[PDB]
Amino acid sequence: EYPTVSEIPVGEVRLYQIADGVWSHIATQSFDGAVYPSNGLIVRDGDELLLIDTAWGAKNTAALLAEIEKQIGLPVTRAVSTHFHDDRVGGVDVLRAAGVATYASPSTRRLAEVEGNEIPTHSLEGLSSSGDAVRFGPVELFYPGAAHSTDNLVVYVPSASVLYGGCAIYELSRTSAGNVADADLAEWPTSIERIQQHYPEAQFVIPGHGLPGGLDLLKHTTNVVKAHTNRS
Ligand SMILES: [Zn+2]
Ligand SMILES: [Zn+2]
Ligand SMILES: [Zn+2]
Q: From ligand 1's centre to the CA of 164, what distance in Å?
């Protein structure tokens, strides 16, 4: 049911409808010669769409906009990037040229600039302290604390009980740590516990890469992060 690398042509994007007005978007990308899938989210709000994260680069993001027009046919008016890495912001310029208002926290914008990645235009206020939550239309944005990155945000869709964990949450298939160069390993389990405490009612949990699951993805991620922490 859920799209994988085998089903996605190079530079193409698939959508997966989760609920009334809620989809994930799935793209693929090469990195160090391996191919990775990558997820984002789309949430309807009246006659417009809210986009969470790019599709990991300009080509994929242009394909994402074309796939949204084909399958949904409503305009994307705002986008939020959930951390500063290129799988979340690469493609922001494509969104901006299409008239989308791009958003990220001030931390994400600063880190993207330092890295040389695309920088969302607008700033999301009220998210600088661990445990902060703000409404953003049909979703709630939550800063759980440092984890995969210091700036990582999670997104909850209350009407559908969908928790989008982004790259702070691993799919079950990933049993060893991914890119931890920008991570706070010491804080990552605590940050996950804040997610569990804030959204214990979540039914569908979306990792940044790979297959959705339930709240067991939070325990899974903690297990993997702790095992990496204990590498010897
Ligand atoms: Zn990342
Ligand atoms: Zn604007
Ligand atoms: Zn990622």
A: 14
- Solved how? X-ray
- Tell the burial category of 12 from Cβ atoms under 10 Å away from its Cβ (0-12, 13-18, 19+): middle
List the shell of residues around ion ligand 1, using CB closer than 5 Å.
85, 167
User: What is the DSSP secondary-structure string of 51-97?
Assistant: EES--SSHHHHHHHHHHHHHHT---EEEEE-SSSSHHHHTTHHHHHH
Counting the structural domains of the chain, the total is 1
Residue whose pair of structure tokens reads 């949904």 in the numeric block: 72
Q: What residues make up the domain containing 183?
A: 5-230
How many Å lie between the centroid of ligand 3 and the Cα of residue 69? Answer: 25
Distance separating alpha carbons of residues 18 and 43, to the nearest angstrom: 10
87 C-alpha vs ligand 3 centroid, how far in Å?
Answer: 6
Q: What CATH number is given to the structural domain containing 85?
A: 3.60.15.10
The whole-angstrom separation of Cα 204 and Cα 221 is 15
Is residue 183 within 8 A of residue 168, CB to CB? The reply is: no
